[PDB]
């Protein structure tokens, strides 16, 4: 029997499944950085979160954009060299080499035989420098802080080789188009050798703490899996390629020096 007040009632659905106006899906939007012990300085990682599950990652970079490529245009090819120290400022002499090989190609000149061995020597010291920073600060974020202090004593010693050739612990400005700036001081290869004979024990101690640890494996195994074909299509390189099985290394495939 219709009554004025129930004049708006509708018959129920034929299967009790009531259509509902689509519910608002809202995730928690969180700023992760810049000032955050894990952001590596200047990452404003804006995360959309459901609980603690990450729905979207929106890296906001540019908090350390300093116009290096425009500044380079007002410099000579030598004045511009120190900008490359401050790009990957953990891999200084490797950056200088990349810039040095470019200009040498354009100049059509060749660095001499000894300076190519100095540049590969310091090219690999810098890799050990870079991998210590990568490995231990990566372990530091996960929560293992001791390996960081063990290996940054080894970095303090490699900084001594940088200073004994260039006079600066980090920004050496030592690899230059055409060769290296100064020759090795006498007695430097002994110290590099003395360090190198002992360094594999240092790697062993770090590995004893991480490689077979079940709390390290659980935090890292099956995490951030990237397939080979997506590695290539995303522009990845280096370990991000060789971690996924791809056999590529420019030192092997397009060798320099």
């Amino acid at each position: 029997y219709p009554s004025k007040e129930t004049a708006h009632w509708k018959p129920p659905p034929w299967n009790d499944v009531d259509i509902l106006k689509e519910k608002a899906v809202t995730n928690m939007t969180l700023n992760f950085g810049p000032q955050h012990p894990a952001a590596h300085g200047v990452l404003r990682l804006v995360l959309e979160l459901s609980g603690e599950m990450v729905r979207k990652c929106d890296p906001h970079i540019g908090l350390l954009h300093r116009g290096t490529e425009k500044l380079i245009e007002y410099k000579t090819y030598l004045q511009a060299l120190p900008y490359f120290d401050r790009l990957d400022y953990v891999s200084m002499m490797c950056n200088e080499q990349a810039y040095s090989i470019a200009v040498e190609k354009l100049l059509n000149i060749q660095p001499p035989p000894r300076a190519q061995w100095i540049r590969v020597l310091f090219g690999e010291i810098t890799r050990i420098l870079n991998h210590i920073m990568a490995v231990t600060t990566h372990a530091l974020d996960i929560g293992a802080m001791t390996p960081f202090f063990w290996m940054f004593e080894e970095r303090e010693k490699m900084f001594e080789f940088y200073e004994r050739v260039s006079g600066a612990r980090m920004h050496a400005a030592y690899i230059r188009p055409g060769g290296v700036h100064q020759d090795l001081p006498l007695g430097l290869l002994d110290d590099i050798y003395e360090f190198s004979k002992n360094f594999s024990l240092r790697i062993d101690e770090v590995e004893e703490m991480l490689t077979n640890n079940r709390i390290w494996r659980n935090r890292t195994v099956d995490i951030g899996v990237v397939t080979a074909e997506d590695a290539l299509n995303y522009g990845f390189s280096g370990v991000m390629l060789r971690g996924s099985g791809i056999q590529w290394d420019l030192r092997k495939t397009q060798p320099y020096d």
Partner: protein, 318 residues
Amino acid sequence: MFFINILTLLVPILIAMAFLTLVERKILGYMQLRKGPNIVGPYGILQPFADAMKLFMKEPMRPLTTSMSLFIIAPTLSLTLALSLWVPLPMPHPLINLNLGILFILATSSLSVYSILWSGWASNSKYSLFGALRAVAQTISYEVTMAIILLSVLLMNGSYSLQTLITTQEHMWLLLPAWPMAMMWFISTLAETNRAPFDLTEGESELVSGFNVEYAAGPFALFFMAEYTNIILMNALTTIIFLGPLYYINLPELYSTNFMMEALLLSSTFLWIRASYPRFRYDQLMHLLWKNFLPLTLALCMWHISLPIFTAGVPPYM
């Protein structure tokens, strides 16, 4: 004369709590190939007092979005329950003698989780709310096993009185007939006290500082005093339960000295553990406790129910 007896409990504990902060920073130091504090006083002995004084002259924070009643209550509760956990501990004679001391320890410990929850919720900040909801997750993880582990050990003891554990361990540590429960008990205490590799509520790496990110100054100092008091207590409790110190009715001084040596040693292993391992993921903390410890704890509960029955080894009621 009872008030003087509070002084000789709450003051030595608070002094011992402070130096635990110094011992932590120096043991972590030498384990990391450095020296830790050693300038502020002879070998840093004054460093704890500097940090305390500085924190109580630091401006305290009253964030505009904060719920002040619970914001203030939470640190006050934290330090109260840390000190209150101590009054029943027999060393070898307790300040307050309770028949169900073990339950008083269980119940007081649980209620202290609400200082993490209320502070985090009252901060009205995203990182402090993440920290609080890890306190909830961490408690749901370790609570069920921790109580059952105590039940298993107390079926060899006969009661919930802590002072009766002294008499149970007159000829042998409970560590021997119970080392599987001690292993599971020990890991629970690291989870109970938010200690690495279980510092998930704080977890500076992922959350900037977790539940106490909006706390500065003296209110933040109270949270830490509570955290480090609990470390000593949980290891002091583990020393009574499992590593029963020597007790001679004629030499009560012997029990305290031996009790201290083992409590210091166990407290060091907390600092040793913090320097050695990476941090768990708080979802994996639940899986550790529910899929490993809990199946073992239920079996050991059933083992220790039957064990006094088929050896005629039922403990006495008194």
